[PDB]
Amino acid sequence: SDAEIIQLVNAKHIPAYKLETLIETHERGVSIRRQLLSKKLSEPSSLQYLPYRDYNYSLVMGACCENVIGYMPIPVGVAGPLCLDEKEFQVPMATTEGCLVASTNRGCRAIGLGGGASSRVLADGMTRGPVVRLPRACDSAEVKAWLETSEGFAVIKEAFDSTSRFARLQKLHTSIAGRNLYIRFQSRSGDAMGMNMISKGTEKALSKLHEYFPEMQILAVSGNYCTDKKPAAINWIEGRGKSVVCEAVIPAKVVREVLKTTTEAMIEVNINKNLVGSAMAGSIGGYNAHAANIVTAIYIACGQDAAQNVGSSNCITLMEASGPTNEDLYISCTMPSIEIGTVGGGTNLLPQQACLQMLGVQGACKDNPGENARQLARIVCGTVMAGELSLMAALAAG
Amino acid sequence: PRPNEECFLSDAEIIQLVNAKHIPAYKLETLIETHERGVSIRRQLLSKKLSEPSSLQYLPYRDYNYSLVMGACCENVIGYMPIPVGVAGPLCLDEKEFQVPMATTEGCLVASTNRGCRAIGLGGGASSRVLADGMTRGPVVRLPRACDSAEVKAWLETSEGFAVIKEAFDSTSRFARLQKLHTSIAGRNLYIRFQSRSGDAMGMNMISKGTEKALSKLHEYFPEMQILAVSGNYCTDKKPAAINWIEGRGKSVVCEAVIPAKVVREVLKTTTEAMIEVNINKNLVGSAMAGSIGGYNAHAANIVTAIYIACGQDAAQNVGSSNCITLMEASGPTNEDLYISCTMPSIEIGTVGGGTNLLPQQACLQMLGVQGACKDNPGENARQLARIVCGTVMAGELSLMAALAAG
Amino acid sequence: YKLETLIETHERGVSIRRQLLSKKLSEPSSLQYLPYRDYNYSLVMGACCENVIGYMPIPVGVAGPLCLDEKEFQVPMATTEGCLVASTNRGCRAIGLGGGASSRVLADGMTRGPVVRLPRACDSAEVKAWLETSEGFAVIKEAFDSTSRFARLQKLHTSIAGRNLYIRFQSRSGDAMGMNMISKGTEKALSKLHEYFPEMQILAVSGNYCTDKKPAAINWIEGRGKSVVCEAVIPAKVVREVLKTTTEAMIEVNINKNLVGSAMAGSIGGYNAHAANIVTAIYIACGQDAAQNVGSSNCITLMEASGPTNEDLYISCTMPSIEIGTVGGGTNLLPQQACLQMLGVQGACKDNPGENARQLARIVCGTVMAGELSLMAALAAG
Amino acid sequence: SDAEIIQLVNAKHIPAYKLETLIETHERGVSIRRQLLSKKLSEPSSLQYLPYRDYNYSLVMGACCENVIGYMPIPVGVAGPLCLDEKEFQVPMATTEGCLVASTNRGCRAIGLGGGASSRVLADGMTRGPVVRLPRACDSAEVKAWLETSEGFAVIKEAFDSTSRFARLQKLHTSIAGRNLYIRFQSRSGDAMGMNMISKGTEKALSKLHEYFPEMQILAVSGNYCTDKKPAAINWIEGRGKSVVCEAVIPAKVVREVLKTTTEAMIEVNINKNLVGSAMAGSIGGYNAHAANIVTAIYIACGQDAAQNVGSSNCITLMEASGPTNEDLYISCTMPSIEIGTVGGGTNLLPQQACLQMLGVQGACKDNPGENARQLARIVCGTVMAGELSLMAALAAG
Numbered sequence A, D: 001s002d003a004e005i006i007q008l009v010n011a012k013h014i015p016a017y018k019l020e021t022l023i024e025t026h027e028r029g030v031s032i033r034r035q036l037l038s039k040k041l042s043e044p045s046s047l048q049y050l051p052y053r054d055y056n057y058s059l060v061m062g063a064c065c066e067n068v069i070g071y072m073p074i075p076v077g078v079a080g081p082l083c084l085d086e087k088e089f090q091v092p093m094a095t096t097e098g099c100l101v102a103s104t105n106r107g108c109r110a111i112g113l114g115g116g117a118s119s120r121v122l123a124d125g126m127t128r129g130p131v132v133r134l135p136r137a138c139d140s141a142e143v144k145a146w147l148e149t150s151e152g153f154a155v156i157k158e159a160f161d162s163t164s165r166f167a168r169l170q171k172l173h174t175s176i177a178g179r180n181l182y183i184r185f186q187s188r189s190g191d192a193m194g195m196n197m198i199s200k201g202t203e204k205a206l207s208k209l210h211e212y213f214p215e216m217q218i219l220a221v222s223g224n225y226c227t228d229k230k231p232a233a234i235n236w237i238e239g240r241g242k243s244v245v246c247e248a249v250i251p252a253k254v255v256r257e258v259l260k261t262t263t264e265a266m267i268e269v270n271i272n273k274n275l276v277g278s279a280m281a282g283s284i285g286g287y288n289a290h291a292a293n294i295v296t297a298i299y300i301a302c303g304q305d306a307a308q309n310v311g312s313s314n315c316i317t318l319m320e321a322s323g324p325t326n327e328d329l330y331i332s333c334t335m336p337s338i339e340i341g342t343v344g345g346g347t348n349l350l351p352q353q354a355c356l357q358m359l360g361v362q363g364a365c366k367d368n369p370g371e372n373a374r375q376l377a378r379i380v381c382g383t384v385m386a387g388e389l390s391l392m393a394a395l396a397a398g
Numbered sequence B: 001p002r003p004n005e006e007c008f009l010s011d012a013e014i015i016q017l018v019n020a021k022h023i024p025a026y027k028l029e030t031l032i033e034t035h036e037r038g039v040s041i042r043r044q045l046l047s048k049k050l051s052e053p054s055s056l057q058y059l060p061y062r063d064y065n066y067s068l069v070m071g072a073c074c075e076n077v078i079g080y081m082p083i084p085v086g087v088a089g090p091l092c093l094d095e096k097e098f099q100v101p102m103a104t105t106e107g108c109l110v111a112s113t114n115r116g117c118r119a120i121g122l123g124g125g126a127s128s129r130v131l132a133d134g135m136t137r138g139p140v141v142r143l144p145r146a147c148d149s150a151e152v153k154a155w156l157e158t159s160e161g162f163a164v165i166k167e168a169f170d171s172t173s174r175f176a177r178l179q180k181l182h183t184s185i186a187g188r189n190l191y192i193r194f195q196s197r198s199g200d201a202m203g204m205n206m207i208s209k210g211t212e213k214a215l216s217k218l219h220e221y222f223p224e225m226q227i228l229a230v231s232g233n234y235c236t237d238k239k240p241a242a243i244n245w246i247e248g249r250g251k252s253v254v255c256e257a258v259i260p261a262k263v264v265r266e267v268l269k270t271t272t273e274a275m276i277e278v279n280i281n282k283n284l285v286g287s288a289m290a291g292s293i294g295g296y297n298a299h300a301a302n303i304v305t306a307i308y309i310a311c312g313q314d315a316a317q318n319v320g321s322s323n324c325i326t327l328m329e330a331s332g333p334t335n336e337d338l339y340i341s342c343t344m345p346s347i348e349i350g351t352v353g354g355g356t357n358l359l360p361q362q363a364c365l366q367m368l369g370v371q372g373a374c375k376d377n378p379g380e381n382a383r384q385l386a387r388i389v390c391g392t393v394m395a396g397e398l399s400l401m402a403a404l405a406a407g
Numbered sequence C: 001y002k003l004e005t006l007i008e009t010h011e012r013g014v015s016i017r018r019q020l021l022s023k024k025l026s027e028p029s030s031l032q033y034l035p036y037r038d039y040n041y042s043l044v045m046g047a048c049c050e051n052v053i054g055y056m057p058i059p060v061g062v063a064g065p066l067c068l069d070e071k072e073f074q075v076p077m078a079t080t081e082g083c084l085v086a087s088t089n090r091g092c093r094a095i096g097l098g099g100g101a102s103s104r105v106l107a108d109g110m111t112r113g114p115v116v117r118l119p120r121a122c123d124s125a126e127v128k129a130w131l132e133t134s135e136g137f138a139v140i141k142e143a144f145d146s147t148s149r150f151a152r153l154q155k156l157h158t159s160i161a162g163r164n165l166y167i168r169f170q171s172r173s174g175d176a177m178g179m180n181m182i183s184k185g186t187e188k189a190l191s192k193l194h195e196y197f198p199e200m201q202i203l204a205v206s207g208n209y210c211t212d213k214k215p216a217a218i219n220w221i222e223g224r225g226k227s228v229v230c231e232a233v234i235p236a237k238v239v240r241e242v243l244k245t246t247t248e249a250m251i252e253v254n255i256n257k258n259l260v261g262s263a264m265a266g267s268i269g270g271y272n273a274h275a276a277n278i279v280t281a282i283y284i285a286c287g288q289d290a291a292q293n294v295g296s297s298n299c300i301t302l303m304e305a306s307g308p309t310n311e312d313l314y315i316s317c318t319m320p321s322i323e324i325g326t327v328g329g330g331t332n333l334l335p336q337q338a339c340l341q342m343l344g345v346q347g348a349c350k351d352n353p354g355e356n357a358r359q360l361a362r363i364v365c366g367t368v369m370a371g372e373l374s375l376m377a378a379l380a381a382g
């Protein structure tokens, strides 16, 4: 009985968050936690409109969230078709911002009428940047030099790669700050975003390094040199996750008819807003109009870590006069740090798997590991370009 | 399936009609009785275009209030995405207790934040202050020459020129109160940063309306001025920028607490000394080595994002809203207690408008006691929400830093 | 270093200091080619340098005439980089043939950004709010301005980091670069603030929030010292004949190097080709603090197609933080005063203080634009 | 004859700079240029105090400066001894800032009394970052991938390495912006700062690349991706020229007696000024008190390119409690991008060679090429640390 389970908890016997570790069902656990919580609110009827029934909590519990009191529905709209690399995509966008999906759809239209967009993945590798300390700067310098010898690296790479199937440690980037040493480990991770995997590899690699340098202190597995979820020039300059570039040419006629402006006006707005304005504002990596809007909408729809829009949104949007008469619009978007995955985390949930299926990238790519994640990154970059096209045209037209 | 001329009806018939008269899918809301069937039909149309027609099987869409969404929050709707909502608390802040809703799919985040809240509560709670409040829009205009743009800048800096602009700006809404103007010249280009409070609304739309009218007025004084774009990226909205870090955008907030040494050992499993050492070398030195502007924290974006999604905020705004510098130092008689503070200069937030107009997110705002407009004191609900965000970020910083220091 | 505190002649003290030093060198004959004789050490001693062992001669070249704001300037440039003066001179030529350049000073105010601490963040917030009120500012201004006839406090920009409070004081300073003057005003203003908030601890008169001699977005965004903009239009014919290239090629190089390249490199304020070269050469020649080229060099160079045929080159250079002065420091020495006289800006402008320093800042911006023009043409031609 | 040269030049409109080729002696050509110039000044007697006589213009002409009208004397002071890596240095500083030499000397004293400082060169390599363009982003991506293959690199390295003896192409860091491709070439350069040498190598390497990709357009030999003389995160994160770290421990007694403060006060000032203050100001690389002051003074004295203090001054100064009682001051300075040389440019002049000799690093190192330049970089970092120590103490003291 609910009432007596509530009475049993209000006897200080069970901590509110320890409900599923007792109640014979998930949804009922959620229901009781809600009742307990309501008594603590200045307005006990607050949760009335927060849904919770008929949701598959099995996949959520012990994997995606804790102290669950329900779920938050985010409207999902569709933008497309997105003509990219000779394929057509119907892009799911979870958002509460009016006109965003419509504007992106218009961008997609202009691209399709232009013969489509092309994209390339330039680099792939998630990172973790721990910070270690030596007794002296002279010692940290010795460690840095050691890590730079082919033998020292092979040893570290062996330890790193030995923690998982996908741990393939690439180049190692190090930076010294006195006796501190920041080490940026970079590795592919199949179709997973890879933070957990890279962390495991990093911990074992640091153990191995410790055998060679017993005086080394592991201060933190993350010394903010990754850099994860904080703006940083290092991600912009070296990339993090997937580095992608996309491009398209919009015929003058399409710019006039679909976008309601001219190539010349677009170019002038892009230079003075996305380049000069961002420069005047002191931006590192924010040379675009609204890439974060598109990245965020797709991330939420596809079960990505939305907090990662911080670095994933880095983007430089470039526009140029093209064609016989210099009236056609050449556009490109370069995104050096798209942190994305199609396996793990929120991608394990069914509704988000549905959005990934819609794009044909759900789960692991059996025949070619990482291909689904790479495809998703290309789709993001292409949709960002469609969004940039549309909003820039609107700003150009006034 | 009836012939098209004969063709409220049958699904297959609407589809056959749609295909034939080539009606775009998004116009379905204005062609079908219920909203739900509108999406149902769009889903069916879409499924035929997918390499795997059964893709949408697990994407929910039934029994959702689309009335509030249509023509306001989203277009081409094919359903909704459920994000798990967890609760962290109580958060003892400014002598009140908050139960904080967090929408996320990252395991252990809610649990970790809850631990942080616990440590704070056992320490006597946290205190916070709103330092500044004002959303911005930074349009770019052009004059024929740099000499002319300089003239405009100087004019905008005279008390009379400003009053004129402020009058035009303020005439657009009750809450539109032009605070100040920061201008910057790049040759003949002139970037003008308009800043104004906006009641309890995040305020982008309102500030934009005010900016357009103010630019019209400015145009009367300088007919040769060309309005290149209502946003010249000088706001700066949704892109990382030093200007938001240095001047603030939306709400600037600071939060602080002192964690007793005993609580650091027992709840956080570490020492004040270890925490301090990790904070300095990760949040300060590490962020400096990585070339960060505004990212002097461990994971403020995780907390900001989770609360934003739960409360109907614009999640894309976590880009600048997440700016934060986390500081830690020895406190107390024995210098063994942990003093901690989080300073967030640019929290873009609102409790009225946008996604906050939807019922499920209004529920999360009600849970915090900040839903909608504050009748008695306009903007107070939005300011309270910003303080809550900064306080929860501090709880999250406390917990994650402890785990990093510890093992 | 106490030699001129004892001995009679300055030149002798230097000879002796050299002798003493000589004993400690692994090559005592090294000082052989370091000059020291016949130099006026009187002005240097106790003002510009200590432990003096001589002087370092830097070649001074001349670029000009620089046609700026309907005047012509012969610009002195101290440098050891070959072709720099020649390249800048070519830039000046192109500008002169284009009808000259125009410039405007947009802002003027040196800064000092001390860091203070309160017991709690709640207290530092209280101090910030007090500082933003008209009465609070008036008293701090009253205190700041009482230290000098030239010190006039313009505004205050404050920033909180928990219980720390960074306060950026900004004030004009006549024709002086103004660091010393602003520091004096800041110390007195902080004393006054302390009377209102006794629990406040003055951690450092400079908390790096000024920001002096370190790259910082704050100087780029708010300006520091003099903010200046310069512009000119170069006729298509002049671009072809003097610069050996086309307007179209120049524009393409400027966008992809100065804008896109600097963006890819993660630059804050470095959207130019080589402004530091010009700033440094003029600073050394004119007795400025050369270490200040760090922020003084901030610059965004922009190029556009201009004219009826859209074949003429429009160019502009915007420099938000030129830290400069024509009185004090190295400007007190005769050789550098000679370079300032050459420009007609030596010493204080008695009638309107600040005018000589403002004129010098315009000259720097104009010369930087001449240098940008020439080097970009050379990069575009290839 | 003097006055007759004037009439001739004015009569044929012979450019002043051409005087060198005209006259015989260098000084007479300078004397005449001054006379010509004086007639054009609002105050003809302006040059009265600008020296020009008895200076060796032979080395300057056609190498260091043009349109010469004299020389500017900068006072040279000495700070030392600087106890670094078990050696003692007498450091020449050219400056007009009062108390700078005195303050730096005090810093040196505290270090000496602490048993000296230790330093290490972490990396060495000057750079040039040209920008090239391909017709499409898909093509620039192809070029990037090609440059990353071991065969493509070897080919480029061969072409680069063939322009000089010291040209040893280390690595390549590439970055795409749509159809633009920025390529950062990095190479050691013996004891020379290396800009000219690296530029030569870059031009030839770009020619070779053009043979493989005929559609590639070389937009500019420097696309600002080097980055030379402009502030940039890339130099901070990847280094440029010499990356150096220096450290020392100052006994508590020495901190009290020589520096007039406490270790605790120093530490508090360093954290809140050099770390937090610089962070609040939005600095990239400026986590120090006044490294630029020391870099500039030494650069001018030693014939370095003073405009390079822009990036050479990047520095992070760190302080912490050390010793048994935790009362001694540990200090370190890390400078990732010291652009320096002991051969070429202004180092070819005698007075500056004198300052380099004073340090024992003048010219090339026959047996260990680059050693003199590396030694000079360590000296700069060590002196910057002495300057940081002293000024921080005075700020801490009040």
Ligand SMILES: CC(C)c1nc(N(C)S(C)(=O)=O)nc(-c2ccc(F)cc2)c1CC[C@@H](O)C[C@@H](O)CC(=O)O
Pocket (backbone or CB within 6 Å): A097, A098, A099, A100, A102, A103, A289, A290, A293, A390, A391, A394, B137, B208, B230, B231, B232, B233, B235, B236, B237, B238
């Ligand atoms: C529905 C959206 C796409 C959006 N749509 C439109 N349009 C008029 S539209 C539907 O035709 O594409 N306009 C703005 C808009 C943007 C800036 C502005 F000043 C006024 C209006 C935004 C606003 C977009 C906002 O999220 C980000 C934007 O602020 C970033 C920036 O440019 O700085």
Ligand SMILES: CC(C)c1nc(N(C)S(C)(=O)=O)nc(-c2ccc(F)cc2)c1CC[C@@H](O)C[C@@H](O)CC(=O)O
Pocket (backbone or CB within 6 Å): A128, A199, A221, A222, A223, A224, A226, A227, A228, A229, B106, B107, B108, B109, B111, B112, B298, B299, B302, B399, B400, B403
């Ligand atoms: C559940 C979360 C809070 C999280 N929790 C924990 N814990 C062990 S916990 C549950 O005690 O708070 N640890 C990490 C973690 C962080 C860094 C690391 F190297 C390994 C693991 C993260 C990871 C959090 C991640 O999203 C952001 C993080 O990457 C930011 C950064 O510090 O750079």
Ligand SMILES: CC(C)c1nc(N(C)S(C)(=O)=O)nc(-c2ccc(F)cc2)c1CC[C@@H](O)C[C@@H](O)CC(=O)O
Pocket (backbone or CB within 6 Å): C081, C082, C083, C084, C086, C087, C273, C274, C277, C374, C375, C378, C379, D128, D199, D221, D222, D223, D224, D226, D227, D228, D229
């Ligand atoms: C005499 C000088 C002005 C100089 N002159 C010339 N010329 C060809 S010139 C005399 O005709 O103006 N070219 C370079 C030069 C510049 C970049 C290059 F890759 C190769 C050569 C420099 C070199 C310039 C150097 O100081 C700064 C420069 O590196 C800044 C940058 O553009 O990144």
Ligand SMILES: CC(C)c1nc(N(C)S(C)(=O)=O)nc(-c2ccc(F)cc2)c1CC[C@@H](O)C[C@@H](O)CC(=O)O
Pocket (backbone or CB within 6 Å): C112, C183, C205, C206, C207, C208, C210, C211, C212, C213, D097, D098, D099, D100, D103, D289, D290, D293, D390, D391, D394
């Ligand atoms: C003679 C010098 C070493 C110098 N010396 C001294 N001293 C008191 S001293 C001679 O004992 O070392 N003090 C300052 C000084 C510094 C900051 C201040 F607010 C007031 C005075 C400077 C000023 C130094 C200046 O060039 C750089 C400095 O501004 C960088 C910064 O700290 O931001």
Ligand SMILES: Nc1ncnc2c1ncn2[C@@H]1O[C@H](COP(=O)(O)OP(=O)(O)O)[C@@H](O)[C@H]1O
Pocket (backbone or CB within 6 Å): A101, A102, A103, A105, A106, A107, A109, B026, B075, B076
């Ligand atoms: N509600 C919407 N949903 C999706 N796309 C939309 C929507 N409204 C406009 N668009 C986009 O804008 C384009 C045309 O816009 P417009 O000329 O305003 O006509 P309309 O809005 O009636 O379709 C469409 O082709 C489509 O890409």
Ligand SMILES: Nc1ncnc2c1ncn2[C@@H]1O[C@H](COP(=O)(O)OP(=O)(O)O)[C@@H](O)[C@H]1O
Pocket (backbone or CB within 6 Å): A017, A066, A067, B110, B111, B112, B114, B115, B116, B118, B267
């Ligand atoms: N599943 C969870 N949901 C919410 N909060 C949790 C959860 N697990 C732990 N916490 C938080 O972390 C704190 C630590 O609890 P636990 O890990 O059981 O260790 P301990 O028993 O040593 O306190 C709890 O007080 C609570 O605030």
Ligand SMILES: Nc1ncnc2c1ncn2[C@@H]1O[C@H](COP(=O)(O)OP(=O)(O)O)[C@@H](O)[C@H]1O
Pocket (backbone or CB within 6 Å): C085, C086, C087, C089, C090, C093, C242, D017, D066, D067
């Ligand atoms: N040694 C120099 N000193 C000063 N200016 C020079 C020098 N050499 C060239 N210049 C400048 O550079 C421009 C180019 O002239 P020059 O070098 O003769 O080449 P060109 O044959 O292309 O005209 C001239 O306008 C002149 O002002």
